[PDB]
Amino acid sequence: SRRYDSRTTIFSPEGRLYQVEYAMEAIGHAGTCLGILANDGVLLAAERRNIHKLLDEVFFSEKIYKLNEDMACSVAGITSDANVLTNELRLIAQRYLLQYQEPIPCEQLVTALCDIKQAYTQFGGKRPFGVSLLYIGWDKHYGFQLYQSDPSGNYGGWKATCIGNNSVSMLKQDYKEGEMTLKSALALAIKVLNKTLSAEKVEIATLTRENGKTVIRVLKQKEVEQLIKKHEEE
Amino acid sequence: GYDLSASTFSPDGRVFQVEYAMKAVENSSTAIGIRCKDGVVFGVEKLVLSKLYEEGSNKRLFNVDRHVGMAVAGLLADARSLADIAREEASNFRSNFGYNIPLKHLADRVAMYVHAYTLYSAVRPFGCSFMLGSYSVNDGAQLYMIDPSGVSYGYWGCAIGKARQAAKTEIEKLQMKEMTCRDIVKEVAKIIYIVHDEAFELELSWVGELTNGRHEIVPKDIREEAEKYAKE
Amino acid sequence: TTIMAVQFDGGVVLGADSRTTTGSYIANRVTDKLTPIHDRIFCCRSGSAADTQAVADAVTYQLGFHSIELNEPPLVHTAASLFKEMCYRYREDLMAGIIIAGWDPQEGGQVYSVPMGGMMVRQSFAIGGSGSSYIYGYVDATYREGMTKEECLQFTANALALAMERDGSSGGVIRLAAIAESGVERQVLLGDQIPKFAVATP
Amino acid sequence: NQYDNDVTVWSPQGRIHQIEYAMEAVKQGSATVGLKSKTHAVLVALKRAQSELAAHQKKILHVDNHIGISIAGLTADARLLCNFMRQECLDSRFVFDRPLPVSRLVSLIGSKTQIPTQRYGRRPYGVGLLIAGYDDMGPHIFQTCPSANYFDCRAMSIGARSQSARTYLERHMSEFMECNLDELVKHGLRALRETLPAEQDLTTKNVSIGIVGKDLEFTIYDDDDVSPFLDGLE
Amino acid sequence: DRGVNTFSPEGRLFQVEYAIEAIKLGSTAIGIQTSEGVCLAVEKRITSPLMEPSSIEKIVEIDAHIGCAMSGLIADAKTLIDKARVETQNHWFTYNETMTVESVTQAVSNLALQFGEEDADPGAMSRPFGVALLFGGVDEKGPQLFHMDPSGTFVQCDARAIGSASEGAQSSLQEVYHKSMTLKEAIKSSLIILKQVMEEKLNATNIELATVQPGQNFHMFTKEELEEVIKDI
Amino acid sequence: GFDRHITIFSPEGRLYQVEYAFKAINQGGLTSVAVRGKDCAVIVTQKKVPDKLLDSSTVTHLFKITENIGCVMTGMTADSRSQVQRARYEAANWKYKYGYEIPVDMLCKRIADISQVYTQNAEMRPLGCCMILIGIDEEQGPQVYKCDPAGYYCGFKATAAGVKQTESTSFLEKKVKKKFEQTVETAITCLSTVLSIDFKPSEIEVGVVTVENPKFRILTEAEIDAHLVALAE
Amino acid sequence: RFSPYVFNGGTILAIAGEDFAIVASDTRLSEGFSIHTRDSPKCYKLTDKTVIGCSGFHGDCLTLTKIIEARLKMYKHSNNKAMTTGAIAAMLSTILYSRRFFPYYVYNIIGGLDEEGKGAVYSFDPVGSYQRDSFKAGGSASAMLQPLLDNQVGFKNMQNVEHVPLSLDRAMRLVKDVFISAAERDVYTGDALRICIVTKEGIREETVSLRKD
Amino acid sequence: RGYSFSLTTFSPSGKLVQIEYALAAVAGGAPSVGIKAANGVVLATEKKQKSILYDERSVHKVEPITKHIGLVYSGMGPDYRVLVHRARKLAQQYYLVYQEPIPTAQLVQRVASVMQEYTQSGGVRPFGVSLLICGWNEGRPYLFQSDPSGAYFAWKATAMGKNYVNGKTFLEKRYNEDLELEDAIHTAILTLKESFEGQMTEDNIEVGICNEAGFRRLTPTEVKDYLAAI
Amino acid sequence: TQNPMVTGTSVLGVKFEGGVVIAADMLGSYGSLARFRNISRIMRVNNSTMLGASGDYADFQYLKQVLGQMVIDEELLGDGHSYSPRAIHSWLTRAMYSRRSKMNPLWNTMVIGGYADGESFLGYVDMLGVAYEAPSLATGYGAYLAQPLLREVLEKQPVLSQTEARDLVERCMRVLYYRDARSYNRFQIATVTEKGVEIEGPLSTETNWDIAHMIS
């Protein structure tokens, strides 16, 4: 009945979308995982849920998801929805291969996912996908690149943007846009996460290469105990 | 506001869109049906508004399958709708199973049709009580009566309408079991003239051994014989 | 494949042969073409084998659900009617010349024939199957009127003995089933119980 | 008024609360009158001119091959209902090759306009037909209604202040079953000439009538042909 | 709120009597059927002067001998103008002749009161078409113009005004037309637009006029013809 | 918002439709108590005719699912026959789809599951009738089950259903901790000790199944009359 | 396996003069080698001024006349105007084409008169191709009646006879002799042609018998 | 028929109002413990009925998904039974296409996938059953929990249902990474023994283990056996 | 087409001053095997119309349940208005043309007849949809054999009393017993008159085999 519908696909009298900016406040409750690119490859830097021992082993974490040989994605907000959509977008990646025998240049993928997620906020009367997930990737066309999207639908090349709480302004006083030298990108990542820390309560993951094929590393345990002692002051 | 939708209960378990349909047949005229050993006799009260309507302006004794009948009470649109789909239901039985439809199965079928039609907010309940009635050569004079709730009971002398509070008493005091239907056609007028307390241009139909499993408006002679039960 | 069913009085007496040939090889020497569908109503089956018992348990479903829906024992005319419908609507895909019988409490002995094209007629005696063309003379000549249970038992027995003797696609034991008021009394005829007839020798 | 989301609901007394209000929506429509003789039934309609001047929104309609109608309510919904009635009347010309009888006609449209009264979010056909035709027996005339409850009537008037035309026409039923065409339609126009606002004339412009019965097609008399019907002074 | 298929405590539908409004909003158009043609005009209400005024289509030719004149909620008519011309060439296709004006007007007005929330496949309409228009056309019966409503009600008309000037221009047009064209109905109709004037003295940039005459097919007037007429007033 | 309108979660859980549907099965109240015998699952219920104008044979609860499963329900009798017809449908569908005749447990699982999808989706009310249903399989003893209008079938010895459920299950709990094929001091005496009528053999319906004869049998006033005069110990 | 057409025969003719259109007919519908009936008309009065002839498979001729009759009625009170003749020819062309892939095996001829009054006659293949003429019989004796009124109407392959326009006496005597000739020479003769003739004042229908064998 | 509009929606705070109500309906459910152990798990739960009247061999709460994967719940009654129906069906799609018993992780992927669209998609309310998963899958056992949101996490021990904070803190106290067989059963029994509302009856608890030979329910003669060995 | 369908052979009929009489033999011939003897091929419908069948009998049972259901359904609307045998003929025509139009055709070829309000009626409806009216009809090989005896007497006098028509179709049915191979001895003769439909079955044919003993 028309008394019962939440009426998600309605413009406000101020013109905005009520169910969309409620998803934007869902990101600020739970969300971390910045991403830094360099002249070399790109990394995510992430946070787990809490200190609660009672957690045996994650193959990959609940944060960094593999998508192709040359792409990966990280997730903010509601974790139940995005899992679905990331499997959804994973399907998209593979069928581009089936249509083209190319490793899907990542802007095609981000455009496709943002079109279907825009389609859930356009009609159907359903709630929008409450996740502002972001993407890292490489293609032969462009360089190493990361994109960042939100439950509204728009996206962009967001060279050092983080998602979730405590919002990135320090990064737009510290990132050198020309050259970055990915070891120092790790150093800047543990700087920002050191302000906002071993791999019990951090989840950092890099994307690099050797001889053409890309390598997605999840930065196993003892590397984090290296970088956490790479400070004195910061 | 626990009202206005058939998919929402009361806080004491009483779906108000059904009992609002039940009073919606209590503001409409009576139609009594009396069982006896040779068949079932119907009789419907008519509340002729103007002189402009002719005789049988609205049929309220429909028939369905060349032997069961349709004394209806409430909204004639809804009653006429379930009358014609009862016609289609006995059509699917006779076409499907060959054997002529026993009335218990038709009353259970139309009963669960109008009941399963009260489980959704996307439909309203029907607003029409109605009753059936016939006999096969080995059935007995089966009649059933169906509420807008969808419950169907076998009766002897059921009466639906506005003045069913009056009408159930005389049918109870009338000798029920062993008389041979012609007298009770005559006696039906006594019930109809008692319960009409205000043109009462009534109408009767039955099924009996004078009919051999059929329906007729009376034939037409008791309309000038049961009219002679004025002054009672 | 030869089926007989004779309405004697009150109830009926069925009868069926037992072979399932794959052209020229008896794949099943011992099968029951008699089968129950409710309690008293039995259907037989002829022609093909795969389709007709899909029809048989399909109408066990529909007839059983209808019979429990009425809380009354159903008529044989009901089952033969949905044999007319179920076999008529699929008439270009089914070779099922089934002839059915049973005792309804209302009428009595009823034997209906649903042949290969798919229809319904009521008969005193019915007959249907592959070999059921070699005994129209004997069944047409011997069946008199109003016979009893023992002489329709031996009548169906030696009629099916003729038809299993002369057809090549019909043979083995024959199964009789006498539907009556007190339930089915079926039996088989095992070898020597078949009424063997003498062959003339030239 | 929580009974405004409302062809599903019941008022707590007995009322369905808007398909009697569609009966109000044909009380608001323009006035008309039909009647029947022993031989041929007639229809008479006055046509409102809410403009400069017009054909005054022509009311009585050709449906048929002797089953004519007289609409009074919504006009587009009326035209939809007579494309239905028209199309299946021609379908009964096609299949059975007989004239479709008037009673089965009005009964199955009485089952066609009954469906949106039943279901959800669908308004009733807010039009009061006043159909009239000559089948095998005498020339029937049926008021039907937006409450899907037709009436096998004789001499019915529906429309704006048509109750006064009824109370003329109720006390003049005795000279029906006689009274041939020339003196019958005079007896219907002086029944129509009470719904007018008490100022003098059934003009040739606004009065359009229709005749149907024994040995004559349902025949429409427009602006010119109504002029041979002239009499009465009141 | 309440839905679209509900009747109002006045007596009519909600969405229909709300669709009679947003006809007062929008530009004004007028038409005069004569004995030798039918003239249509519309003051299409240009907003800014920085711009191009000859692409505000408010006189649209359905066929060569049917021209419509819409107003109100503009560009909501394009689906039913599309249905008007597709139905027109379907009629000429299947029947090899011209049309009437009550057949295109019969065909369009069936689509007006044809909407609803829960119905068939979602290619249906939700709101009614909030555009009132009138088909100026010439037939073998006669030149004539059929004023539609958003309710699906269409009427015969010989002098009809729509838009915001539906009272004063209609009452002025009620007293100035009885006879015939003889070239001056098109000059006594822009005179009604001259009384209507909102922003500018009705030059050949803000009014679009087109006549349909039985000899020709139609004539959407160009600029020098218009300002040839405006010079005569 | 709509916690007490739609089958959705309120705060602190407790969706407010199934206990509004539980209160629906107490409407009027014609009350079943089912007795289980290590060899005989008897059925008892009370049934009141209003006015000696009903046909007393036609009014019943006591339906027959198949040749081995009977049932009795105490809800609102409108929602009863829509539920028992689907149970007959799934019984015959089980026998057509999986061979053997359906055993009593997963029948009640299945009608409990469609009652679940009533109380999972919106736009349908969870229909208020609970199905006391008995039956015997080859492996175990006689069983009895009751799916509620929420879909929670349990597997009972001796519950009851209808008005006065708590007094009945208190009497049965106090009269089962002592240890009954005859069931003469258990079956009727739960009714006559709860509501104190000490019935004549009209108003009580009894449906037995036995291990020696698994066909579901509804008893008549002769054998239930001997069953009642056996309460003279 | 089924052969859903037979050839029930019949030959129908229409001639367009200057104010008339003689739509001839025959009667005997017959397939195989046995005749069915001798009553059956093949000229159908569509409007007061349009008469169809309809020959070929008789059941599909019959259903086709039901469709064009019911859609003529569907036109007539959708525009409040009767059909013309050329519009009948057009919509019957798209009815015949609309079921192309299982076609209406029927040769039909539409006579009648135009808007101005002069008679016209439209000929059809069984899939729909209309040409207006002043002759062209069709359907069983199509290739028999055609060369006579190629000569006695069209005056082709013929020098200066000083040809006059046709009338309701010369063309009246030109229909009976060609059907007694085709009654002699065709097998699908007809025993009584029923000439539905159309004129300005209305319509009449002359009948006269033939060789009955 | 149907609604085709989601009743689960976003609050003005920016959170799902129906899902926290679903976790409330879980938190008002019967308490259930689950202990991942070095070779195999134990998933205990508490079956307190109304009276001593019912058949405690009739309904189960430990019940397998077709090969070696059992799953135990806490919360709504029959919504669990729907999730067992869907879970068995998804495990048999996987078994008929890939010809091995399903990895536990993928079964939790697909069960969390089917529980997500009931937080959307047309009038359906979310399930409100946070059932937990077991499974031996090759080499080392697994354990999960699909919340009525649709999230899932793997661990070494958990509890759910009533007073589950005491279960999580108590299992955080008494857990060892090598603690492997029947000692896990021991601490599971003395996690349900913590409240139980009284007397620790063997017919009111049932456990299920995954001892490298398929998930199997424990017979009622075995739980009472260790209830004799308390 | 696919199987040896169970057929009849002929329903021949003639109209007369009074009503119309149609006749057919009871035979269920399973492709040169008289498998079904007592099998009625004469349907009664409402009291002024009759119906036969010549081809497939299973399709005739389909038509007797749809004609039966249709005529009882419109029979119980009350208001008079039974089917004139116009409408059974036209409905059966459109049913068969709409049935072969989808290439799933009814295979029987019947004749329906009946006495209307004014005069009688005898119409033929073919397997393909070839439908017409005639003073006298015959189906199947009767259309080759009974049809000459029918359209010989009716060309002499197109007026028959009831006994002349009844003896005429009895004699034609005897001829089809003599020549048609798929023909059986006993037959139902069936007449509709002003008083209604009545079916007088079954009858016999007095055979004349006296020419047999002149063969050498």
Coordinates of C-alpha atoms in Angstrom, one line a residue, chain B residues 13-14 20 31 39 70 110-111 117 122 147-148 159 180 184 208 210 220 227 229:
Chain B
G13 CA -7.5 -11.0 16.6
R14 CA -10.4 -9.8 14.6
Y20 CA -17.4 -4.5 8.2
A31 CA -33.6 -14.2 1.4
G39 CA -35.6 -30.4 -2.1
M70 CA -28.1 -18.5 -5.6
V110 CA -16.5 -21.1 -3.7
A111 CA -16.0 -20.9 0.1
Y117 CA -9.7 -13.4 -1.3
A122 CA -4.5 -5.8 -2.6
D147 CA -20.5 -15.6 4.6
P148 CA -18.1 -12.9 3.4
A159 CA -31.8 -16.9 6.5
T180 CA -43.3 -32.4 0.7
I184 CA -43.6 -24.9 2.3
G208 CA -37.7 -30.6 -6.0
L210 CA -41.7 -31.5 -9.3
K220 CA -46.2 -18.9 -12.0
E227 CA -50.3 -13.9 -2.1
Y229 CA -51.4 -15.2 2.9

